[PDB]
Amino acid sequence: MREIVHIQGGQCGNQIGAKFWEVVSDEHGIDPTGTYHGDSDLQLERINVYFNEATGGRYVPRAILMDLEPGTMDSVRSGPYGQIFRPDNFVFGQTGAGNNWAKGHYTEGAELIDSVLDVVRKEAESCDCLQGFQVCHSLGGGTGSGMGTLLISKIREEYPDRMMLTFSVVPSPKVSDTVVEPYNATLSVHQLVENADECMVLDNEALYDICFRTLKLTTPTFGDLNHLISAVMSGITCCLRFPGQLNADLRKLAVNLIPFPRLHFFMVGFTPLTSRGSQQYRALTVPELTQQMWDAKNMMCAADPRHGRYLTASALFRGRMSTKEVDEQMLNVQNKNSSYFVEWIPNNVKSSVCDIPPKGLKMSATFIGNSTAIQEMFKRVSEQFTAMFRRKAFLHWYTGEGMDEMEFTEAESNMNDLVSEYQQYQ
Amino acid sequence: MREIVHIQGGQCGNQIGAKFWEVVSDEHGIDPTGTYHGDSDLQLERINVYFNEATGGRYVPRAILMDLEPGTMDSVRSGPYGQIFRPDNFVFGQTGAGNNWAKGHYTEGAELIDSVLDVVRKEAESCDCLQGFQVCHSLGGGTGSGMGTLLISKIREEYPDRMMLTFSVVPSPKVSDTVVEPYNATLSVHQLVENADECMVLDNEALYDICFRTLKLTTPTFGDLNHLISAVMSGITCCLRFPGQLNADLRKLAVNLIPFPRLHFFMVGFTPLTSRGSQQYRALTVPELTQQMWDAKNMMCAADPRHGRYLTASALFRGRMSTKEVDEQMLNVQNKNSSYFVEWIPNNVKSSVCDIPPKGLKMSATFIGNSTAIQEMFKRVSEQFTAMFRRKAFLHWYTGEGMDEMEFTEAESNMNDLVSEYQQYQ
Amino acid sequence: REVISIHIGQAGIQVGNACWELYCLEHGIQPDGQMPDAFNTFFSETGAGKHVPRCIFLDLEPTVVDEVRTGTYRQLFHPEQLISGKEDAANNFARGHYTIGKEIVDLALDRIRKLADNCTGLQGFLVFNAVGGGTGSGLGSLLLERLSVDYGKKSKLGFTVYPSPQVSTAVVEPYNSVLSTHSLLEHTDVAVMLDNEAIYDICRRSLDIERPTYTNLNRLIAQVISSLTASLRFDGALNVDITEFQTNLVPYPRIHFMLSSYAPIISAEKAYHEQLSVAEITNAAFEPASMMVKCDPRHGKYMACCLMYRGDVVPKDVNASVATIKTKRTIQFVDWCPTGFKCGINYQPPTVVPGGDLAKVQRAVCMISNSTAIGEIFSRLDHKFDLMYAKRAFVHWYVGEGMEEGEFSEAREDLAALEKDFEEVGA
Amino acid sequence: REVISIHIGQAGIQVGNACWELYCLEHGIQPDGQMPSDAFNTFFSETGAGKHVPRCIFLDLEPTVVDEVRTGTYRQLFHPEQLISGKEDAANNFARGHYTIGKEIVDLALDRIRKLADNCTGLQGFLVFNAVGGGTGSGLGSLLLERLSVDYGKKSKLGFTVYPSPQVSTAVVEPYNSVLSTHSLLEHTDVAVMLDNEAIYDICRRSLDIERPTYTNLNRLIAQVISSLTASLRFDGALNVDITEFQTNLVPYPRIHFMLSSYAPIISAEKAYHEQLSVAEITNAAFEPASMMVKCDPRHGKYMACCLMYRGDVVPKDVNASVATIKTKRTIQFVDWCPTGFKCGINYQPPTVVPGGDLAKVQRAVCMISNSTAIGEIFSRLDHKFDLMYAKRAFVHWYVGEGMEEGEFSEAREDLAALEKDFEEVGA
Amino acid sequence: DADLGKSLREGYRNQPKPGDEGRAFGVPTIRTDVRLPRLRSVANACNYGNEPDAGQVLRPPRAADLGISDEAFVALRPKSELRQLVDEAGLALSDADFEAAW
Amino acid sequence: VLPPHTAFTATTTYRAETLNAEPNTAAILDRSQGLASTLVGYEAARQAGEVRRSDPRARAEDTARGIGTQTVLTVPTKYGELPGYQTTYGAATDKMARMQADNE
């Protein structure tokens, strides 16, 4: 019925997508060779949303992996659940962008985007009732951000009526992996604000802090971080894949969380995340999940939301639960800390319940908050962008490829008016 | 009943016919000794279209080789299914044309064409009711083009009310065998626009492109290209040899595709084509065939069909298929990309279904699209022809043999007005 | 005599899942469809030993519907009436009224056509919808409009699920609520509000279930519906049809919004506890601690009340109890209406459901009254609606669908006029 | 009471292969051709003892499907001399089928049908099965109809023709073929019944919901329709009407004979198990466009006369009541000139099942055959796309090289224009 | 492929129920196999089983005025019942001829 | 070298479906028998149902529940159902399914 096609860009997008299709495959009970061996046929009734049957129950993911460097593809095919992708979908360049948005948006896109557009089109009309697209990429790197950005623009120009998710990782000064982070991030969101329907902002710092405090894990490799983000993404799409008492589709959450067309950036949190030694000592109730949801040290962004106001929020619950308890918990958290929410919108919380929990858990919850604390992050980026732009440092690598100065100025302008309207509604 | 006699001209025609008779003999279940070894009774029912039984179940092809150098003869005799042919039909010169169209149409023809006409006569009246003749040849070589096109003219003089298929590979500048390719091909088609009923335009460039992208082979030797065109020719006459839900013989294929007598140049493509890695990751449905049929990376000509419009198109299907699905699919493809089709003809797609797929497969298809994109190929050859004719390079080996200049000028004139009427109907 | 029931939205069909479960359990029909004349008003006797219901489930998302298609009641409902779209309206009245409705309402009504031609003595329709959602509100209203232009003169009982004042699960449900009332006003004939917080309180207080789900809510809601049609289905000492609601409860053509209540809501052990008689249940059907709509009826005056009795009830004591009600002064009536009661007595007691939390009782009362407390409810909705519309929030979704500010302002002022009318009749 | 059946074309003989299977299954005849332990007399003549041979001729130009029939299981039903097969196919060419190969094949066809009619005694009429889009069924079909009209004339010829659907099509020159067929289909046959393919596709999508239907289910349902039409001759009913009744009660003017067909209830096994089956709802279901055999919208048209065959357990009381309800309803509208626009007929025997079919055993069934102006709409729809291709002289050279000219093209175009004028007049 | 000829899905499958291989899925107009209503309603548009035809109602048997419905004759009765009936009425026939007629 | 061998087995449409109707219907409908409607679309489900088909109390309970476990062949099974998977519809109809199984 409703269909979600997947897009992965860049190194981070590939590794994130790899873990994503790992957990989804484990959720639907399909083996790493591509055959179903699960238990409940409740898994079968909604595998078409993510899979197409090839020959004798060979379900392949409806995904498109795309980057510019083969080492990422090798790391994809190395691990398990790497032999289930259709090798045609590995559309793939050869030269490499190398943390250059101009290379990822004008040079390499000119010979890769018609190819990925061919593949995504064939993948689009292959299914009947498209629900939307799901993108996993970055904003600091070159081949993920720029190529994905131009791809998003082309897609939104072809299919204006379908939905669109974008999971984009943003950088921080504390964890600054590359140098041109603001040069790329500013331009990326400057395109996202007019192209994407909504964006779920991520980062690594919040993940490190979460594994510091809540998980008490020793060495958090990228796999566990991608494992968390993957658990988030399975949670956000649980409503379509399983029956429930109150189902909230993708468009349904978007219309409940987006009151204004340019206010479509969310922060995300996932519960429950507890250390293994302390996993035994806890009860498993809705208040137990609620105390962890509304903890500000549990968001997946470097924007402590109690420095601002929640415009709207949404909770996606999985597991057999009392809807009464669900709602009165939402009413209580909304009545006590009433200054943390916006005033001119009553009932700022959209809730939904699905009956099937993620595997291995009794009762889980995915939180999506559209708060105005994200303007702290954007200002935290724009000041770095202006600090660099005043001195025109590292700018010749961009202007020597086809980009000019006015694109940077309009990125500054859109950055500034966005944070101005965020500050306004605060 | 309906009859097809086969003629092979030149080295390319011979090797193509060699693979072709191996494929057909495999389809009808006769081993390379000439005896019958099939199991299902559907194979016997229509072998009179291609074979004659001689003595006690010895089945032999209704074929006539024709060339001028015994290397090709030993080449076709050495391989399997080589000793099943007609030792008396090996009608054959000894001097050799040497890529000189004047030699292929005036010098050796004067002493070989009486003999080939003798044997093609014997083969024609040996059967009761002809359906048409089938000639495989090139347009670049000498003994293929020149001798072939004279044979066509003499035959059309003898039997005017019979059908005629000609599979001719055309040269490309990117894949250029000889230097006199425009000198041969220009005069060859100049005779083909007035003599032959219809042709199937082929070329090696598009075949190499297919073995690059869709097949992903490393070594595409001539046997591979020849195996492709053989599957194409098996598809084009699967309707005669096997019953269907909707039958389309050669003549009604012709009457449906040709709206004007001079417009009889077709491009052709085949499905399905998968690499052995991606062979496991694909589905087998009518939409899976159609999405690969109408792809421009599947046409076996060097003419991008989106550079022009489709006049008519045909889709021969093999396998037990849903007719409703076939029709809605052809309707949907015609209504989606309505720009690439012609306006003043409704329902531009003639479709047919045969209930016998190729051996080992589940469902297959053959696309024959009469588009106006082929005029790019004719301009591609005509401009080279005028470039050489501007100062008469290589002309004298043609002049000193009996050919004069007005033949060349009449060939250019016919080239100019056929592309003119192609552009007119575009 | 026949009555068909349509279910719009994800909420309506869950109500249907408990409602039809109770009907088949009442007439002794196993989920496979056959018994091992009273059934005639809900089930048509197809074939030989088979009964199919007179309903249409319809929804745009197929998840909940095809769960019904594959549940235990696969053989009862044959899936030809279970209409299902391809994609949701997603809490968008405009999407559910113009984009998707224009392809689904026609298929619904040319199915309801031959349902109605099958029936012979059709009383009317009764609709189950939730006006907080997108599908129930948008094409629900659209279906009601085309029903009115198709038949018009036939009665339509609308059992709606309004949003609660403070307890809420959606965000834009004020927009969808107001846009539903603008057509629910002049298209429905008899509208019964039912809210969720009131039922949560009932199940928490009387049924002492500390953790209820939607199932228990839908179970006692089905108890209400079955109790108000039991007069048609079974013979009683004094029975009343669907037309009596319109006659005895609708004073004026734009005042049709009835509070509902039920008694006794008693668990298994509390039935061992308490002696159930007509007087105390007639009293209990008047406290706000036992109403289906969260509102204070003391703040208003009751224009006209309707009491359905089921079980061991004699006209003497029910008339004695209504006498005490008429003479009590804690609840005041409206001066204009002098005789503001419509009684109804049916013999068959209400049935139990295995796994249900209610116990079997000798007798039960379904009260349906009309007040001005609803006049308080709509103003309470009107206030929080203008709070959002003052900032033009969430409007871009609707106008992007293709609507405008016109129906916004006209539905806003329509509730304003309804407010002035209720304030004027309360005199 | 006897009637014979000729099949002209690839589509005609597939319809016939369906029909004769159905007829043998109805009458209890094994495919060998004998009855294991009188009604059959309208289709089967009994040669000698213990044999029953159909009164039918399949005829075709390409021999493929005909000898597929010959090699199938029905070798013993039709022995090999009635199945006429040419040597090469007309190949979607009306000229080639009407002038080139017709001249050799029609004489054999006609002097076989002569001895068929002579073996027959009380011949009611002929019935022809063809698709006007192809080449054979167009050209040689018209040739055969002309020669049969000149041989007999006064016998009624039931033409169950298959027209090309508006948007769904498999040929390219079928507009030309249909125009040239209709030019003679107007003035030769007596009662012509239209069947498109897209209407049956829609039916099998909606009611029988077979998402991937082949031609055989279409042909099965067409055979069911034909069986329901001829059950009045085959079996005694409470109210029987023969083939002359369509001639009389359905044709108000000598050039208006184009009938829309409809069948009900086209229903599966548990869908019938679900649905309470009675006469009122099936008479209803016979009338919505979602159950017609022709893709047309009769809401835009006005009925002239309808005929309703009922088969099974049907009493006259409820059929009269349902017809009264229909006549009183205002959703559909009959033509003013005819006051009384209905003709009912009832037959006792229920329609049978076919193993491998998609329909279950049903208590009662209705076949509606109606006259309207949706057919004049359809003819103009066809005329438009014919003229579109004819304006550029496309494909004209094939017919011209076969030997026809521009004259017949222009006169068939103006004949279709005349028919359009006729229809827009009668609709007044 | 599987869904080629048949609908193949559970709600629309052509396969009949294994309880009854052959039966016409519909409502017979005579309703000959239904439990008799305890008391037929005043408004009854349907008939159950044996109702006398017009050929009989136009010219009734003599026991029709006494109140004996015509189905009371055709209903089956056991041997002791028949014996008591012929003993209650003044038939006075011997057991030999009684057994013969029986 | 030539391919080893490929047997030719595809029959024509006529023979296949209008001469072997009785075996054809049996085979086609016995492929898709146990599966529910929304589950029968996928081919792996049919294969699973076949291997499953190849306690009468458990069988009656199954055909009563409908979508509980048609394609079963870690998570251990309880006497009634699976631990991780319990839908609200089934939780509501447990008693009706049990009564139906008992009556069967």
Ligand SMILES: Nc1nc2c(ncn2[C@@H]2O[C@H](COP(=O)(O)OP(=O)(O)OP(=O)(O)O)[C@@H](O)[C@H]2O)c(=O)[nH]1
């Ligand atoms: N009382 C009651 N209300 C319900 C139930 N299920 C859903 N609802 C109400 O339904 C409203 C949301 O709409 P839904 O029923 O989920 O779906 P919808 O009405 O079709 O709107 P969409 O979500 O766009 O499809 C919420 O306000 C719930 O209060 C139920 O079982 N009982």
Ligand SMILES: Nc1nc2c(ncn2[C@@H]2O[C@H](COP(=O)(O)OP(=O)(O)OP(=O)(O)O)[C@@H](O)[C@H]2O)c(=O)[nH]1
């Ligand atoms: N209803 C139905 N129509 C068919 C069937 N087969 C072919 N047709 C129709 O026949 C038309 C074309 O003519 P055909 O019957 O295929 O062939 P023909 O009429 O003998 O003409 P030729 O191809 O020249 O021999 C197509 O438009 C199809 O719609 C069938 O099995 N059932």
Ligand SMILES: Nc1nc2c(ncn2[C@@H]2O[C@H](COP(=O)(O)OP(=O)(O)O)[C@@H](O)[C@H]2O)c(=O)[nH]1
């Ligand atoms: N969570 C997660 N983040 C990653 C991973 N790989 C890279 N990143 C983030 O992506 C950013 C750099 O992305 P990059 O590899 O340069 O993107 P690309 O070069 O365009 O493909 C860094 O800030 C990292 O934090 C990964 O495996 N997991």
Ligand SMILES: Nc1nc2c(ncn2[C@@H]2O[C@H](COP(=O)(O)OP(=O)(O)O)[C@@H](O)[C@H]2O)c(=O)[nH]1
């Ligand atoms: N497909 C295919 N084409 C061939 C083969 N051999 C030669 N050709 C084509 O034939 C053309 C030259 O023709 P030539 O061999 O000189 O023909 P001839 O001398 O008349 O026999 C070249 O453009 C080749 O592309 C072959 O084995 N397969």
Ligand SMILES: [Mg+2]
């Ligand atoms: Mg909903």
Ligand SMILES: [Mg+2]
């Ligand atoms: Mg034909």
